[PDB]
């Protein structure tokens, strides 16, 4: 509702918001956002049409991003600087208030987590891969569960124990056969899934 | 003017170049070596009219010798500096010896020195990409020349310039291009040490004050099998030491000591030195424990070689 240069001056300092752990971040269709960018001439180089109404973004629409419209589950292979564009918390609330959203939609929150095999770094966790899970007794049966990178193997172990009718008293071993031919065996029950470096959609079996 | 002196001084010049004129005549079909001696001589006198002439004379019989185009084209760029002339010679070098990237890269710098329009510089680069080169390294060199050019168009003072986005778009475009087209034709990556990613990381961390992007890039460099190199980690460390914090240096160095395969001792001394100058006593002790452990295993493996 305020002026175009009010809006532009307000979201200007969104840039400095470094990605931080336990950080809440969201998804916006780049197509909508680029239109808004043009609308307030956020990019200094492009401000010709200014706040002229033809350029008006309207209510936020991210329908294109979802795979199933009803379930609101997102599409695969979505990239950062082309198909969407990330956004801080307060930047949502402001941009929520000003434009609203298409009915039947809910904000696509996600949070950054620390990942990177060698050099550690911050990136918004998305497209986590339903890791394949299995049991020693049934080689055919495979479950595919989602695991955050911040999630520790212990959390992973706990979730494995819950779905294969196994209680606490008996011990357990976990192993990873990833691009190695040989069967390794997982040792640490404290670290994350990242410092272990497990690959997406792969049979971690107990 | 008093002719006869103009006639006499012109005769002294004729006598001076005469031994060279005869050696060129008695020699072989390209007499390229004889041309080089003639060119060297003409460069000592430093007369612009004669240097163009002698070069042009040599290029008549040796138009396929890239080293000759380079010396000629470089000369115009260092001495004469005439737009219409220097650009004409670069363009002529590419058409005669397209397989050499230097002729192309020097063409793009020279176009830049003479304030050629961005659109015209850009379309030339695209032609370079369709030119036929022999090494994978050649393709990274052309890309690097173009990326530097794009960088010099950016005003880094400003947080968000378009030219900066053009630079960043080119970078994305360059790495994907190196991975698919150069790997496809050569069946080896064209950038083993990820020098393009390195440059992008340096730019992104020093000039645009973007350390997170710098880190993901360095992680990717290490992922590509560069983690075993001591000097490679030190490049990352040195980048972090300047625009990152101490906390990130310590973890990296902790990572470096563990992964380094060529000179682990070098990174250990560097880790210990940092803690000595900046770390707490506990930070230091941990460093000594980890270095002792890594170093114990390395000397052990050396021992295994011998036993085995």
């Amino acid at each position: 509702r305020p002026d175009a240069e009010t809006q532009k001056s307000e979201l200007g300092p969104l840039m400095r918001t470094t990605l931080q752990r336990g950080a809440q971040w969201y998804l916006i269709d780049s197509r909508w956002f680029k239109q808004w960018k043009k609308y307030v001439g956020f990019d200094s180089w492009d401000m010709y049409n200014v706040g002229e109404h033809n350029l008006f973004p309207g209510p936020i629409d991210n329908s294109g991003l979802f795979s199933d419209p009803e379930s609101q589950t997102l599409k695969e292979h979505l990239i950062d600087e082309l198909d969407y564009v990330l956004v801080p918390t307060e930047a949502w609330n402001k941009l929520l208030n000003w434009y609203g959203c298409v009915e039947g939609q809910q904000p696509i929150v996600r949070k950054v987590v620390e990942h990177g095999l060698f050099v550690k770094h911050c990136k918004v966790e998305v497209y986590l891969l339903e890791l394949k899970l299995c049991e020693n007794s049934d080689p055919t049966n495979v479950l595919s569960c989602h695991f955050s990178k911040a999630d520790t193997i212990a959390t992973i172990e706990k979730e494995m124990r819950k779905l294969f009718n196994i209680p606490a008293e008996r011990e357990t071993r976990l192993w990873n056969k990833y691009m190695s031919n040989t069967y390794e065996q997982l040792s640490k029950l404290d670290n994350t899934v990242q410092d272990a470096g497990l690959y997406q959609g792969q049979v971690l079996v107990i | 003017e008093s002719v006869i002196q103009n006639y006499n001084k012109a005769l002294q010049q004729l006598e001076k170049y005469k031994p060279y004129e005869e050696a060129l005549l008695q020699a072989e079909a390209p007499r390229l070596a004889e041309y080089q001696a003639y060119i060297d001589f003409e460069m000592k006198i430093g007369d612009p009219a004669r240097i163009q002439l002698i070069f042009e004379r040599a290029l008549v019989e040796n138009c396929l010798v890239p080293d000759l185009w380079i010396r000629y084209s470089q000369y115009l760029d260092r001495q004469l500096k005439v737009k219409d002339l220097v650009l004409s010679v670069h363009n002529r070098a590419i058409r005669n010896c397209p397989w050499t990237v230097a002729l192309w890269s020097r063409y793009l710098l020279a176009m830049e020195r003479h304030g050629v329009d961005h659109q015209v510089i850009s379309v030339t680069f695209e032609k370079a990409l369709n030119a036929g080169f022999i090494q994978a390294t050649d393709y990274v060199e052309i890309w690097q020349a173009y990326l530097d050019y794009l960088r010099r168009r950016v005003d880094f003072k400003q947080d968000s310039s378009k030219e900066l986005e053009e630079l960043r778009a080119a970078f994305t475009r360059a790495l994907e291009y190196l991975k698919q087209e150069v790997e496809e034709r050569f069946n080896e990556s064209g950038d083993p040490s990820c020098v393009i990613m390195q440059n992008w990381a340096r730019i992104e961390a020093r000039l645009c004050n973007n350390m997170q992007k710098a880190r993901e890039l360095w992680d990717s460099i290490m992922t590509r099998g560069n983690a075993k190199y001591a000097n490679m980690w030190l490049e990352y460390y040195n980048l972090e030491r300047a625009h990152g914090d101490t906390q990130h240096c310590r973890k990296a160095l902790h990572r470096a000591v563990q992964c380094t395969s060529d000179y682990p001792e070098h990174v250990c001394e560097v880790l210990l030195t940092m803690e000595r100058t900046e770390g707490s006593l506990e930070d230091w002790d941990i460093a000594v424990q980890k270095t002792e452990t890594r170093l114990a295993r390395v000397n052990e493996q050396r021992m295994k070689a011998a036993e085995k």
Side-chain angles (χ1 to χ4, degrees):
Chain A
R1 306 186 303 98
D3 200 327
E5 81 243 4
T6 58
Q7 304 186 6
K8 171 180 51 178
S9 179
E10 182 69 16
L11 291 190
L14 84 84
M15 50 173 183
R16 62 191 184 188
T17 308
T18 39
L19 286 57
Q20 309 200 2
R21 294 157 162 234
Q24 258 123 6
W25 294 89
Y26 308 71
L27 290 188
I28 302 180
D29 187 10
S30 54
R31 320 177 59 198
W32 183 98
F33 194 57
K34 64 189 59 171
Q35 158 127 354
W36 185 85
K37 281 175 166 164
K38 304 162 205 172
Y39 190 84
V40 283
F42 183 92
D43 303 312
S44 47
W45 35 274
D46 186 344
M47 304 184 48
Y48 319 113
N49 311 33
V50 203
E52 176 187 1
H53 293 271
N54 197 339
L55 193 44
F56 187 63
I60 303 180
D61 196 353
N62 282 3
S63 67
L65 322 181
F66 320 124
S67 179
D68 295 36
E70 169 224 277
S71 304
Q72 211 183 206
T73 62
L74 44 62
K75 191 175 55 184
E76 201 179 346
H77 306 81
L78 289 163
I79 303 180
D80 183 26
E81 290 184 39
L82 188 42
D83 207 327
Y84 62 86
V85 40
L86 297 150
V87 43
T89 46
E90 296 177 350
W92 226 110
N93 284 329
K94 297 285 183 176
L95 133 153
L96 196 184
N97 201 323
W98 299 341
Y99 304 94
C101 74
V102 163
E103 179 178 310
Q105 291 183 350
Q106 296 181 2
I108 303 180
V109 86
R110 318 269 154 148
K111 59 181 180 180
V112 72
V113 327
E114 169 200 359
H115 46 288
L117 306 177
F118 304 91
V119 169
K120 297 158 160 194
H121 46 116
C122 281
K123 181 102 200 326
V124 193
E125 230 288 32
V126 190
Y127 261 79
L128 187 189
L129 299 300
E130 331 308 336
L131 202 62
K132 301 177 177 178
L133 304 178
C134 177
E135 198 176 12
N136 204 169
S137 301
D138 307 331
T140 57
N141 296 14
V142 168
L143 283 310
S144 301
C145 184
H146 48 282
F147 286 132
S148 184
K149 237 105 174 187
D151 281 342
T152 49
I153 303 180
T155 7
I156 303 180
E157 180 61 56
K158 160 181 176 175
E159 176 66 18
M160 237 172 319
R161 310 189 84 167
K162 78 155 289 195
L163 196 54
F164 270 157
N165 62 89
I166 302 180
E169 72 283 356
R170 67 167 160 276
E171 291 70 16
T172 21
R173 75 247 170 261
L174 196 47
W175 62 90
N176 41 332
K177 46 176 91 174
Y178 171 42
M179 61 177 296
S180 179
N181 183 7
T182 63
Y183 299 174
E184 301 181 357
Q185 180 176 346
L186 166 67
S187 40
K188 180 58 113 59
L189 197 91
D190 177 44
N191 57 24
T192 57
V193 70
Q194 177 57 216
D195 38 29
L198 180 60
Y199 172 65
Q200 111 156 30
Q202 190 153 192
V203 186
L204 197 64
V205 36
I206 303 180
Chain B
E1 208 138 25
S2 329
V3 314
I4 302 184
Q5 168 181 339
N6 182 341
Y7 172 77
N8 292 335
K9 300 292 184 277
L11 269 37
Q12 200 40 54
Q13 266 183 28
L14 181 147
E15 188 175 19
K16 182 193 45 180
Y17 294 122
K18 106 153 122 173
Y20 296 96
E21 284 292 335
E22 180 178 3
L24 76 47
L25 194 52
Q26 311 300 339
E28 296 177 350
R31 334 175 193 78
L32 169 64
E34 289 77 4
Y35 269 123
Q36 287 169 331
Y38 208 147
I39 298 280
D40 289 336
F41 184 65
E42 285 281 38
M43 295 206 63
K44 168 153 160 182
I45 294 169
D47 185 349
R50 300 206 66 88
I51 294 169
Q52 294 180 223
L53 173 59
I54 183 300
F55 263 122
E56 291 290 347
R57 287 179 63 184
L59 284 170
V60 172
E61 181 60 0
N62 300 276
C63 51
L64 300 149
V65 186
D67 293 313
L68 182 54
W69 286 103
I70 294 169
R71 180 204 294 265
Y72 186 23
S73 160
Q74 107 168 332
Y75 164 77
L76 289 177
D77 279 332
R78 276 164 169 88
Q79 313 289 8
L80 270 60
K81 300 183 173 187
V82 180
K83 176 179 302 179
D84 295 351
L85 179 50
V86 310
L87 296 184
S88 166
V89 158
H90 275 97
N91 187 318
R92 287 166 53 176
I94 63 180
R95 301 190 309 235
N96 284 268
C97 306
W99 57 84
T100 22
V101 200
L103 289 160
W104 289 93
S105 59
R106 296 176 181 247
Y107 193 9
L108 296 177
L109 39 86
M111 289 176 71
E112 179 175 356
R113 281 192 205 87
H114 292 285
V116 180
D117 190 23
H118 168 55
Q119 290 56 358
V120 172
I121 294 169
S122 187
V123 63
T124 298
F125 164 71
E126 226 71 37
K127 298 352 191 176
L129 289 180
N130 296 325
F133 306 120
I134 298 169
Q135 292 177 340
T137 72
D138 295 359
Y139 282 90
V140 318
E141 180 181 341
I142 183 60
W143 265 112
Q144 201 189 220
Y146 188 59
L147 288 170
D148 296 340
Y149 160 68
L150 290 172
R151 179 200 67 75
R152 297 184 204 99
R153 291 182 67 251
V154 174
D155 179 340
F156 283 101
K157 313 195 192 62
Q158 230 131 281
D159 300 0
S160 300
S161 19
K162 180 180 167 187
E163 294 103 349
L164 183 52
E165 302 310 331
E166 278 173 356
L167 176 63
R168 286 165 166 165
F171 266 115
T172 301
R173 163 160 147 87
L175 293 69
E176 73 156 45
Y177 189 93
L178 269 46
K179 194 168 184 179
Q180 85 202 350
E181 287 89 343
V182 195
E183 191 191 66
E184 187 104 44
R185 55 174 316 193
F186 295 95
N187 296 349
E188 57 180 340
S189 60
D191 197 11
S193 49
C194 302
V195 290
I196 293 169
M197 305 182 74
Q198 278 188 57
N199 288 346
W200 194 2
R202 244 185 310 253
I203 293 169
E204 206 67 70
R206 178 154 193 113
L207 305 177
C208 324
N209 179 22
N210 187 359
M211 190 70 198
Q212 293 174 151
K213 179 63 169 293
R215 293 170 185 161
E216 93 178 279
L217 280 164
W218 265 104
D219 177 38
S220 186
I221 292 169
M222 297 302 86
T223 283
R224 257 84 150 180
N226 276 327
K228 54 156 293 179
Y229 300 111
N231 62 35
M232 221 64 179
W233 280 111
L234 291 166
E235 217 58 56
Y236 174 46
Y237 161 67
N238 275 310
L239 189 53
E240 200 83 49
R241 176 152 78 99
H243 314 291
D245 52 18
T246 298
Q247 189 52 46
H248 277 96
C249 292
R250 196 164 324 101
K251 298 181 351 193
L253 282 176
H254 277 338
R255 189 58 179 179
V257 62
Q258 291 187 30
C259 299
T260 298
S261 290
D262 55 2
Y263 310 107
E265 276 93 356
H266 186 267
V267 310
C268 292
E269 173 164 0
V270 184
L271 169 60
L272 289 166
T273 296
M274 176 193 74
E275 302 295 19
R276 285 185 24 121
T277 68
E278 202 175 355
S280 66
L281 188 276
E282 196 79 12
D283 284 6
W284 159 264
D285 280 332
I286 293 169
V288 190
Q289 189 61 19
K290 294 187 180 193
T291 56
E292 273 183 2
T293 294
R294 173 64 191 174
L295 172 84
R297 179 184 189 274
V298 162
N299 197 320
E300 183 288 330
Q301 279 283 15
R302 189 51 66 155
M303 258 184 218
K304 185 191 176 179
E307 295 215 346
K308 273 199 250 209

